[PDB]
Amino acid sequence: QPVVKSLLNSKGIHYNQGNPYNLLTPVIEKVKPGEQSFVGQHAATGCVATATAQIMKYHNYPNKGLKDYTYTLSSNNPYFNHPKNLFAAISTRQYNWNNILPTYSGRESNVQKMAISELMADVGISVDMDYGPSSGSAGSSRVQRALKENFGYNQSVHQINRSDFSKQDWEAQIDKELSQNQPVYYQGVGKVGGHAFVIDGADGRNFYHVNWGWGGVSDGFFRLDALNPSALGTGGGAGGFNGYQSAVVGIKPLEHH
Ligand SMILES: *CC(=O)[C@H](Cc1cccc([N+](=O)[O-])c1)NC(=O)OCc1ccccc1
Numbered sequence: 001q002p003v004v005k006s007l008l009n010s011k012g013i014h015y016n017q018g019n020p021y022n023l024l025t026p027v028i029e030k031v032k033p034g035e036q037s038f039v040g041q042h043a044a045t046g047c048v049a050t051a052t053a054q055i056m057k058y059h060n061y062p063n064k065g066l067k068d069y070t071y072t073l074s075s076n077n078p079y080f081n082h083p084k085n086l087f088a089a090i091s092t093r094q095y096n097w098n099n100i101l102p103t104y105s106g107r108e109s110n111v112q113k114m115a116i117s118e119l120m121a122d123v124g125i126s127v128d129m130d131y132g133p134s135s136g137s138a139g140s141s142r143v144q145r146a147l148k149e150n151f152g153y154n155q156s157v158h159q160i161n162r163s164d165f166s167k168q169d170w171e172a173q174i175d176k177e178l179s180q181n182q183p184v185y186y187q188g189v190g191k192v193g194g195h196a197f198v199i200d201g202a203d204g205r206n207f208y209h210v211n212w213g214w215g216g217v218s219d220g221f222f223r224l225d226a227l228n229p230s231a232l233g234t235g236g237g238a239g240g241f242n243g244y245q246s247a248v249v250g251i252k253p254l255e256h257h
Contacts, residue, residue, distance in 0.1 A: 003019040004178040006209040011100035015213040017044040022118035032078040046135035048196040049124035050213035061253040065093035066152040088125040140246040156250030185248035188241030192232040
């Protein structure tokens, strides 16, 4: 395993799912029975969108969106009145990567905040985000399609599933991406839910650097079979994203880079 210093940290890239990343997600409409109100607040961007947007910022790509996307929220979503259709005019977008900053502390301009919020909202819509206080997407299978079909990334983009490879061949694919300066979209499931995040480095002893999409919290080095951030888990126990694992690899704009 080659040593690769965190690719996203080298470019200052640290996004989250709340403000000011979520200023253009749908505004919650209803109180879920038995829950406190989130009415009038923007929905979370979704960890799938935050992970994908961080990788897109690493490439500063695309300059122009390629294809619009439309979908309808599940009618069992309790936060919105139904039917609720969502639409992103991605084919008209000119993303200004000077305004989509690597991270946000609060002092940025409204133009800069709207720039990342627009990208976050477009990406979430393109993966059929089930918006709410928490926002869920199927992840990899939608991400790989969106990156190519809506955002014009190279045909090298594809999902790989952990169950299809030996441990060595799985890690060798991740290592190959990192050797080509290509952060990897990654997701998994376990006893603290399902989460999507970015693998962007390697320490030479079979640990990988992870950007969890929480603004920096819990980022660090993890084994791919012990993706267990301490920021999650109530009661003191163990838990991580070690089942049903998949990745999106080949993420680059061009045929060679
Ligand atoms: C990480 C995140 O925002 C989201 C959390 C979540 C929100 C709403 C519903 C669920 N749910 O499990 O029904 C979860 N998780 C997420 O989007 O996970 C993506 C994913 C990870 C692993 C496998 C499939 C999908």
